[PDB]
Amino acid sequence: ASLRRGYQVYKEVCAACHSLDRIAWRNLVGVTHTTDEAKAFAEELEYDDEPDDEG
Amino acid sequence: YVKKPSYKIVPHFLGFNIPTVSKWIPIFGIWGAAAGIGALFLIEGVPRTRQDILSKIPIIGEHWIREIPASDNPF
């Protein structure tokens, strides 16, 4: 319960300046969040895809 | 009066004969059980072993029927 609250502090305060590059969304699952909550966090963001057909 | 000792030669091969080997048949059986138990124990962790063998054993078999809740599974 403290881990989950600490994630929220990270997300709302520290994340403005600090990365957490070694943690994937899957790592939160079954630790702080359900599969669905973590999928929702991931799906809100945009990541680089592979180039389209025109490259 | 006896003119000759009364005996025969039993079939043998590489110094083994059927009377001797027959005494050891049960022992091979037990060693086979030991090897079986041991082998199965070694692969008890393998998912296929659980699915195909261990979960089918009556009463005991539910020890190996374990599902991760969908909420807790990233994959």
What is the DSSP track for chain B?
Answer: ---S----PPPEETTEEHHHHHHHHHHHHHHHHHHHHHHHHHTTTSHHHHHHTGGGSTTGGGGG-----GGG---
Q: What was the resolution (in A) of this experimentally determined structure? A: 2.0
Cβ of A34 within 8 Å of Cβ of B71? The answer is yes
Contact assignment for B72 to A34 by CB distance below 8 Å = yes
Q: Which residues pair with B10 in a beta bridge?
A: none
Question: CB contact, 8 Å: B71 with chain A?
Answer: yes
Interchain proximity B72–A35, CB inside 8 Å: yes
Q: Which experimental technique did the depositors report for determining this structure? A: cryo-EM
Task: Answer yes or no: is A24 a known binding residue.
Answer: no
Backbone angles phi, psi at B44, to 5 degrees: -60, -30
Q: In this structure, what token pair is assigned to residue B62?
A: 């539910």
With H, G, I as helix, E, B as strand and everything else as coil, classify residue A29: strand
